[PDB]
Amino acid sequence: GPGSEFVRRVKTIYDCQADNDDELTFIEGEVIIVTGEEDQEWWIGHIEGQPERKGVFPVSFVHILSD
Amino acid sequence: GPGSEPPPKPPRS
């Protein structure tokens, strides 16, 4: 999962509207604090500094950010 | 509906 691969924060690389009520909506260029794994294609997290914006999101829609 | 065209998302499980 993201934890085991040392993923703590990521930046979004596309826009994304939730299709289900557990999915995070975001625009490109936002930072997500990654806090878990949904499945092999989806991680879970919240927007850095806006933790009420939270949910699952595609692994392929983000890129790892260094500390 | 003028928004960007993001790539297909993976399916949910």
Numbering used by the authors:
A (entry chain A): 1081 to 1147
B (entry chain C): 824 to 836
What does the paper say about this structure?
Src homology 3 (SH3) domain is one of the earliest discovered and widely studied PPI modules, which can recognize a diverse array of the proline-rich motifs (PRMs). Interestingly, although varying in amino acid sequences, the SH3 domains have a conserved architecture containing five antiparallel β-strands (β1–β5) and three defined loops of RT-loop, n-Src-loop, and Distal-loop, as well as a short helix termed as 310, which form a highly conserved hydrophobic groove to recognize PRMs. ASAP1 was reported to play essential roles in both membrane trafficking (e.g., Rab8/11-coated vesicles) and actin cytoskeleton remodeling, which are highly associated with the MyoVa’s functions. Previously, we identified MICAL1, an F-actin disassembly factor, as the binding partner of Myosin Va (MyoVa) by using the globular tail domain (GTD) of MyoVa as the bait in the pulldown experiment coupled with mass spectrum analysis.
Importantly, compared with the typical SH3/PRM interactions with ~20–200 μM binding affinity, the isothermal titration calorimetry (ITC)-based analyses indicate that the interaction between ASAP1-SH3 and MICAL1-PRM has a relatively high affinity of ~1 μM. To unveil the molecular basis of such a high-affinity interaction between ASAP1 and MICAL1, using a shorter boundary (828–836) of MICAL1-PRM, we determined the crystal structure of ASAP1-SH3 and MICAL1-PRM complex at an atomic resolution of 1.17 Å with high quality. In the complex structure, ASAP1-SH3 adopts a typical SH3 fold to interact with the two crucial prolines of the PxxP core in MICAL1-PRM. In addition to the proline binding, the positively charged residue R835 (position 5) at the C-terminus of MICAL1-PRM packs with the negatively charged patch on ASAP1-SH3, indicating that MICAL1-PRM belongs to the class-II PRM. In the SEM5-SH3 structure, an aromatic residue F165 is located at the center of the hydrophobic pocket and provides hydrophobic contact with a valine (V4) in Sos-PRM, whereas in ASAP1-SH3, this position is replaced by a cysteine, C1096, which has a short sidechain and thereby unlikely contacts with a short-sidechain residue in position 2 of PRMs (e.g., V4 in Sos-PRM). Instead, such a phenylalanine-to-cystine replacement allows the long sidechain of K832 in MICAL1-PRM to fit into this pocket of ASAP1-SH3. In addition, the positively charged tip of the sidechain of K832 is fixed by the interaction with negatively charged D1099 in ASAP1-SH3, corresponding to a glutamine residue (Q168) in SEM5-SH3. Either mutation C1096F or D1099K in ASAP1-SH3 dramatically decreases the affinity for MICAL1-PRM binding to a level comparable to those of the typical SH3/PRM interactions. In contrast to the K832E mutant that completely loses the binding to ASAP1-SH3, the K832R mutation mildly enhances the ASAP1/MICAL1 interaction, confirming the requirement of the positively charged residue for the high-affinity recognition.
